[PDB]
C-alpha cells in the first residue's frame, strides 16, 4: 500500500497482556498485535513467551511497510518488556533507541484499593 520504512514501536506490558503497535513519527498506527490474540489465555497470556510470539506476529503484519529502523518505548510494568524488544531486533528491524514511557502521577489520583488474597 504505502511505503514509510521508518516508525516507532509502542509496547504496553501490563500484568495480564502485552500489546505491540507499530506507528510512524506522526503517531498514526500501521499495525498492531496482542499476546492474547495468538491463542494464549489465562496464565499463558501473562507469560513473556506470549509477548515474544506476539511481536513476531506484529512484524509479519507490518512487513508490507518494509520498515528498517524502529524506536521501542516501554509502557507498563508487567513482564514481557524485554521479550518484545528481542523479537523486534531478531526480526531484522534495526533498533534505534529504547526509552521508558510509563505514566507516573505526581500524587494526582487515588489508586484502587489493594485486593486481599
Amino acid at each position: 500500500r504505502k511505503q514509510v520504512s521508518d516508525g516507532v514501536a509502542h509496547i504496553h506490558a501490563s500484568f495480564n497482556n502485552t500489546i505491540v503497535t507499530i506507528t510512524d513519527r506522526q503517531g498514526n498506527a500501521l499495525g498492531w498485535a496482542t499476546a492474547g490474540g495468538s491463542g494464549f489465555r489465562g496464565s499463558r497470556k501473562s507469560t513473556p513467551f506470549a509477548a515474544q510470539v506476539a511481536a513476531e506476529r506484529c512484524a509479519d503484519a507490518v512487513k508490507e511497510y518494509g520498515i528498517k529502523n524502529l524506536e521501542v518505548m516501554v509502557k507498563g510494568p508487567g513482564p514481557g518488556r524485554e521479550s518484545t524488544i528481542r523479537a523486534l531486533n531478531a526480526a531484522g528491524f534495526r533498533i534505534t533507541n529504547i526509552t521508558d514511557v510509563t505514566p507516573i502521577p505526581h500524587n494526582g489520583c487515588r489508586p484502587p484499593k489493594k485486593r486481599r488474597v
Partner: peptide, 30 residues
Amino acid sequence: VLAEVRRREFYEKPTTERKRAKASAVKRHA
C-alpha cells in the same frame, strides 16, 4: 521507575505507610 509503579498500583492507607517508614528508620540503626 519500576519501584514506583509497585507503590502506586494499589492504594495504601496513610497510617500503614507511616508505620513502615518508622520501621525502616529503626532498621537502618545497627
